[PDB]
Amino acid sequence: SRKLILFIVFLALLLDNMLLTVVVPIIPSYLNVQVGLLFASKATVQLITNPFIGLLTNRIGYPIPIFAGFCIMFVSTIMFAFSSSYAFLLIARSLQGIGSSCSSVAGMGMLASVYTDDEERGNVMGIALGGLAMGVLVGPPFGSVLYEFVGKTAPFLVLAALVLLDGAIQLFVLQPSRVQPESQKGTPLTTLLKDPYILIAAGSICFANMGIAMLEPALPIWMMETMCSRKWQLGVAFLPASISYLIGTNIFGILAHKMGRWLCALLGMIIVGVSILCIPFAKNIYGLIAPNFGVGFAIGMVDSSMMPIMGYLVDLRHVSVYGSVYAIADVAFCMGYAIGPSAGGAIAKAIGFPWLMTIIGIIDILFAPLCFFLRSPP
Numbered sequence: 001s002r003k004l005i006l007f008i009v010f011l012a013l014l015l016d017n018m019l020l021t022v023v024v025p026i027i028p029s030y031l032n033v034q035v036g037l038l039f040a041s042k043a044t045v046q047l048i049t050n051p052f053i054g055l056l057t058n059r060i061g062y063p064i065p066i067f068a069g070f071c072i073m074f075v076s077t078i079m080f081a082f083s084s085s086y087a088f089l090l091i092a093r094s095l096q097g098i099g100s101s102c103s104s105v106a107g108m109g110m111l112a113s114v115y116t117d118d119e120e121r122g123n124v125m126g127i128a129l130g131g132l133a134m135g136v137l138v139g140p141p142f143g144s145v146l147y148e149f150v151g152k153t154a155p156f157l158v159l160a161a162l163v164l165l166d167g168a169i170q171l172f173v174l175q176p177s178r179v180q181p182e183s184q185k186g187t188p189l190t191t192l193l194k195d196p197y198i199l200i201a202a203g204s205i206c207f208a209n210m211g212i213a214m215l216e217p218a219l220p221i222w223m224m225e226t227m228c229s230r231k232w233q234l235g236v237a238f239l240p241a242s243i244s245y246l247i248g249t250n251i252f253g254i255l256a257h258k259m260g261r262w263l264c265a266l267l268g269m270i271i272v273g274v275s276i277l278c279i280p281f282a283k284n285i286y287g288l289i290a291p292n293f294g295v296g297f298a299i300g301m302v303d304s305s306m307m308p309i310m311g312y313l314v315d316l317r318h319v320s321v322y323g324s325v326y327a328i329a330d331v332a333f334c335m336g337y338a339i340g341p342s343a344g345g346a347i348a349k350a351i352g353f354p355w356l357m358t359i360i361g362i363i364d365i366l367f368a369p370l371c372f373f374l375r376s377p378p
């Protein structure tokens with residue numbers, strides 16, 4: 001009965017993303033450079049602290065970092081509930097970033113260590129990546145209704161209660177009582193970063209995520225400038241991408257092994273490039289549904305095909321320890337999540353938004369054929 005571990009990782013991934021999207025629309029109203037710093041602090045701190053957790057998991061194990069992630073996330077949720085100042089907001093966001101890094105790295109490492117089968121690893125990481133998608137979709141309406149009806153602190157109090165329940169479950173099953181070092185060495189990061197295949201996988205993930213990371217804040221400004229759409233059109237414009245990410249992840253986590261992980265990644269990169277290229281031609285929302293659906297489905301195909309390939313490469317060419325490589329993958333995600341909005345806005349101000357989308361699409365299409373080198377020798 002190792003499904004209890006999968007349940008814990010899924011719930012943890014769902015709750016940070018639920019808190020991530022709830023805070024986004026609430027703080028700016030009550031609160032250029034400082035706002036951008038507040039937005040990017042979580043990603044920057046997580047990117048900085050990924051390697052330290054990756055190294056620590058080889059020394060003390062997974063349960064102590066996983067339990068620490070719940071304690072930091074509970075503290076951050078309480079501080080978000082009660083604090084009302086800028087410095088406290090920065091501290092809460094930094095703590096949220098640290099907790100998210102711990103949770104993601106430790107959970108992915110434990111999932112890779114427990115489900116040693118190649119196909120089952122992808123099967124379970126499909127559901128694990130599903131939890132992030134569910135949190136992004138469920139969070140905004142939850143936060144909006146609780147803020148409208150009960151009060152400002154009600155969504156954060158409910159999230160704190162859910163985190164407390166998750167921590168009670170973790171204490172019941174994980175039982176982080178002692179410190180247990182791992183058996184073998186860790187294959188230091190300098191040797192892993194010299195592998196061209198790991199670099200190719202990380203670059204594919206980084207570019208695929210940077211596409212949507214730059215697209216998501218830039219599109220609303222263009223929609224107001226060109227189509228003069230109302231408030232709710234901006235909100236419901238990115239719903240197809242959110243649904244498509246969930247559907248594509250849950251399907252391709254199982255479907256990628258039969259077709260081939262390299263082929264799935266190549267097709268995903270081509271599809272996302274074509275969709276981003278076709279986005280600027282839209283004239284209204286009906287012209288924007290299909291491109292957004294395609295972008296989300298393609299990002300779901302790339303992620304669910306490139307996590308188990310990282311695990312497989314580490315198993316094949318180095319020692320079977322996964323904390324460091326999954327810290328590398330989390331760093332690849334945070335690279336897109338950190339400098340995305342600011343650079344995207346700067347480019348969309350220097351040149352046109354369609355030019356930015358064209359550049360992103362061309363870059364993705366040109367990087368697509370590099371995934372051919374990831375195919376297995378036999």
Ligand SMILES: [NH3+]C[C@H](O)c1ccc(O)c(O)c1
Nearest residue numbers: 136209212241242245296299
């Ligand atoms: N890693 C998840 C991926 O970057 C992502 C996140 C939010 C989304 O709405 C999405 O379509 C994809």
